[PDB]
Design an enzyme around this catalytic site. Structure first.
Site, mmCIF file in Angstrom:
data_model
loop_
_atom_site.group_PDB
_atom_site.id
_atom_site.type_symbol
_atom_site.label_atom_id
_atom_site.label_comp_id
_atom_site.label_asym_id
_atom_site.label_seq_id
_atom_site.Cartn_x
_atom_site.Cartn_y
_atom_site.Cartn_z
ATOM 1 N N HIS A 1 55.330 35.565 63.437
ATOM 2 C CA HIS A 1 54.260 35.271 62.482
ATOM 3 C C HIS A 1 52.856 35.373 63.078
ATOM 4 O O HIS A 1 51.867 35.324 62.352
ATOM 5 C CB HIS A 1 54.445 33.876 61.830
ATOM 6 C CG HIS A 1 54.016 32.737 62.705
ATOM 7 N ND1 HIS A 1 54.907 32.007 63.466
ATOM 8 C CD2 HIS A 1 52.783 32.270 63.015
ATOM 9 C CE1 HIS A 1 54.236 31.149 64.217
ATOM 10 N NE2 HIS A 1 52.943 31.292 63.965
ATOM 11 N N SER B 1 50.879 27.988 68.102
ATOM 12 C CA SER B 1 52.053 28.774 67.735
ATOM 13 C C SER B 1 52.192 30.060 68.535
ATOM 14 O O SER B 1 51.198 30.669 68.950
ATOM 15 C CB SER B 1 52.098 29.038 66.215
ATOM 16 O OG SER B 1 51.254 30.097 65.834
ATOM 17 N N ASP C 1 61.770 33.705 63.913
ATOM 18 C CA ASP C 1 60.341 33.897 64.163
ATOM 19 C C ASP C 1 60.125 34.282 65.637
ATOM 20 O O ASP C 1 59.728 33.459 66.469
ATOM 21 C CB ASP C 1 59.622 32.599 63.822
ATOM 22 C CG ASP C 1 58.132 32.763 63.763
ATOM 23 O OD1 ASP C 1 57.647 33.909 63.858
ATOM 24 O OD2 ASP C 1 57.444 31.735 63.612
#
Lengths: 10, 257, 27
Positions: free
Chosen positions: B43, B205, B99
């Site tokens: 992502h 992230s 992910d």
């Protein structure tokens, strides 16, 4: 607010 | 990172910063797994809901860093992306299942006191350490608070932040959210009763969730900072990509390319 | 082969300030 990455470095 | 502390020098030498060339900004964390391969969250590179679909030339990775904003002369190294590889079954439509993404560097980065790769877990190390209660470590230059803040109201850090967090029982992870959780994810963080706090937050992230094996004293990357709801909220937990579960894909990519 | 061994810590047998917290959680 990021100090620029001087060429050469790239 | 919320409720963490300043990292020590060379504490997370595999830490990588994913940097957008223009405008210059921190996009995500990442990790160094060899001199030419960097691991991150899919992502961070592809997320259609937010019109995000980066191409190699849109990005740069900075390795060996401590300071968030400063150019660390004689210390950090800049690497360019040769190719981005996103898991073919990365589910950006629903819950960020799988992910994970790999980025191959154009040239090998030079290892030093501040640059060194983390290990990827074998099946046994993962089975032994990926258990509720066992703590892993999260590092990143993300926000220090959920509430939108910058360098004026305790918003972003001056240097790399670190926090140790316990893996949470799967039913508790499931019961904390309305999102469908999969076996390719695990969650970590303290419960409301436990007192201690901490979580990853905006900008962390793609970064690593690591564990130090008590069997061979090596650091292993067990997860990738994937998603959460808010940051450090009571009753919520950070979610991470289960690296071992996706290792077959990782190995396939590296062997092939 | 040298993965996960930090130059400034494992390589010189120095421990960082909170790694013990992880070890204590294992078991």
């Amino acid at each position: 607010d990021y100090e620029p990455i001087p060429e050469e470095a790239f | 990172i919320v409720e963490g502390s300043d990292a020590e020098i060379g504490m997370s030498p595999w830490q990588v910063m994913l940097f957008r060339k223009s405008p210059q900004e921190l996009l995500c964390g990442a990790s160094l797994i060899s001199d030419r391969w960097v691991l991150t969250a899919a992502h961070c590179l592809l997320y259609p809901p937010w019109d995000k679909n980066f191409t190699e030339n849109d990005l740069l990775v900075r390795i060996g860093k401590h300071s968030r904003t400063r150019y660390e002369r004689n210390i950090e190294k800049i690497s360019m992306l040769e190719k981005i590889y996103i898991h073919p079954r990365y589910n950006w439509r629903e819950n960020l299942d799988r992910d994970i993404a790999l980025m191959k560097l154009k040239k090998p980065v030079a290892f030093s006191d501040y640059i060194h790769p983390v290990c990827l877990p074998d099946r046994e190390t993962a089975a032994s350490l990926l258990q509720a209660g066992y703590k892993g470590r999260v590092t990143g230059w993300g926000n220090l608070k959920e509430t939108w803040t910058a360098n004026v109201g305790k918003g972003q850090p001056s240097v790399l932040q670190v926090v140790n967090l316990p893996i949470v029982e799967r039913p508790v992870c499931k019961d904390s959210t309305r999102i469908r959780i999969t076996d390719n994810m695990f969650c970590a963080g303290y419960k409301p009763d436990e007192g201690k706090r901490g979580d990853a937050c905006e900008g962390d992230s793609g970064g690593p969730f690591v564990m130090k094996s008590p069997f061979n004293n090596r650091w292993y990357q067990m997860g990738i900072v994937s998603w959460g709801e808010g940051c450090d909220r009571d009753g919520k937990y950070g979610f991470y990509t289960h690296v071992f579960r996706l290792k077959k894909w990782i190995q396939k990519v590296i062997d092939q390319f | 082969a040298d993965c996960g061994l930090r130059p400034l810590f494992e390589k010189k047998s120095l421990e960082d300030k909170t790694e013990r917290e992880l070890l204590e959680s294992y078991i």
